[PDB]
């Protein structure tokens, strides 16, 4: 772990705080508390208060960048949300297209390194690029389906779930009908990536490889589904935090303004103080629980890209 230029923490500085800030306007408190420790870092270094606040004070650029970026996505959720099954239908499909850009950027960054003299990266991101590309294309075309040739069951996972189980069908539902050969070309391109992965290793290695190619093929097959399956935590924690904040705010705003006089100031002051006190602990709980993108980006993102070099490289990037 002595990499200075590349490639340990190049895309983690943008993919880390952008994907981490999607789970968290509730982002104004994280930006204020993160920006408050800038000038008070020297005095707060000798205060001795907590163990996670010291590591958050050391990584001031990560909490400042992720806290500043968390206010943008956090202000949009808390698009609009007024009922159930309305805001989650767009926030659920938004994390797939948001994570697909970082997934393609990690494959492009991994393909850029090691520079036939290249290989072991042309077969990767071909089956998941076709299945996830058609699923993201069906989600992008699903939000334009007006007139009637549309629908929201869900879309996204419903079209990919119905697809790959019927060769004679075309799309179910809300997909591009031109006409049926999208699933045949996707299944042919995904099935053709099997021999090209292990076949491209000896050609790219030259100008015990069998077990490494089989373990890399099974690990790429498991990580291809696990990487796309792990994207639900951003929309899950975002919808849970937005519902948990809007429930208390909608359940305290109406009772705060009633009983005018001294009872409205005292009950509104105590209810607003307890509401903001629980909201700061809930935002600190979500910010503490937002390490899944750092762990999955540190292990799964670092496994296909190339270690703890990206964590120090992300904080050292904004410092220099």
């Amino acid at each position: 772990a002595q990499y200075r230029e590349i490639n340990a923490g190049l895309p983690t500085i943008v993919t880390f705080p952008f994907m981490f800030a999607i789970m968290f306007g509730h982002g104004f408190l994280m930006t204020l508390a993160a920006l408050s420790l800038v000038l008070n870092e020297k005095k707060i270094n000798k205060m001795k208060r907590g163990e996670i606040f010291d590591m958050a004070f050391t990584g001031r650029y990560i909490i400042l960048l992720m806290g500043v970026f968390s206010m943008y996505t956090g202000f949009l959720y808390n698009g609009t949300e007024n009922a159930l099954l309305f805001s989650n239908s767009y926030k659920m499909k938004l994390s797939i297209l948001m994570g697909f850009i970082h997934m393609t950027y990690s494959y492009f960054f991994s393909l850029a390194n090691h520079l036939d003299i290249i290989g072991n990266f042309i077969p990767g991101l071909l089956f998941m690029q076709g299945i996830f590309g058609y699923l993201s294309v069906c989600i992008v075309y699903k939000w334009a389906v007006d007139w009637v040739k549309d629908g929201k069951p869900a879309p996204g996972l419903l079209n990919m779930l119905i697809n790959m189980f019927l060769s004679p069908g075309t799309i179910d539902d809300e997909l591009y009908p031109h006409q049926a050969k999208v699933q045949v070309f996707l299944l042919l391109m995904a099935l053709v990536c099997i021999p090209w992965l292990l076949l491209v290793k000896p050609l790219h290695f030259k100008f015990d490889i069998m077990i490494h190619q089989v373990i890399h093929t099974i690990e790429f097959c498991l990580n291809c589904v696990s990487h796309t399956a792990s994207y639900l935590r951003l929309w899950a924690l975002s919808l849970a935090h937005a519902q948990l904040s809007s429930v208390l705010w909608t359940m305290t705003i109406q009772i705060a303004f009633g009983f005018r006089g001294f009872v409205g100031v005292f009950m509104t002051v105590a209810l607003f103080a307890m509401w903001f006190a629980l909201t700061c602990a809930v935002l600190v709980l979500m910010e503490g629980t937002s390490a899944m993108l750092h762990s999955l980006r540190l292990h799964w993102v670092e496994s296909m890209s190339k270690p703890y070099e990206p964590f120090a490289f992300e904080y050292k990037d904004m410092e220099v």
Partner: protein, 57 residues
């Protein structure tokens, strides 16, 4: 109607960190604006009127 028109309008009238960059931290400063702009483009916030009539059923 969609956010692809606004993201295409941002991408069309924007270089997206192209091509040169500064001397100190040219890689992070070069890819940081393209990563933040691409993160905003996927974060374009394409609201209702494609899946409207909420509060159902």
């Amino acid at each position: 109607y969609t956010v692809v028109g606004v993201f295409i309008v941002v991408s069309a009238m924007s270089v997206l960190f192209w091509i040169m960059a500064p001397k100190n931290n040219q890689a992070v400063w070069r890819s940081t604006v393209i990563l933040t702009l691409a993160m905003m483009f996927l974060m374009w916030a394409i609201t209702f009127l494609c899946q409207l009539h909420p509060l159902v059923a």
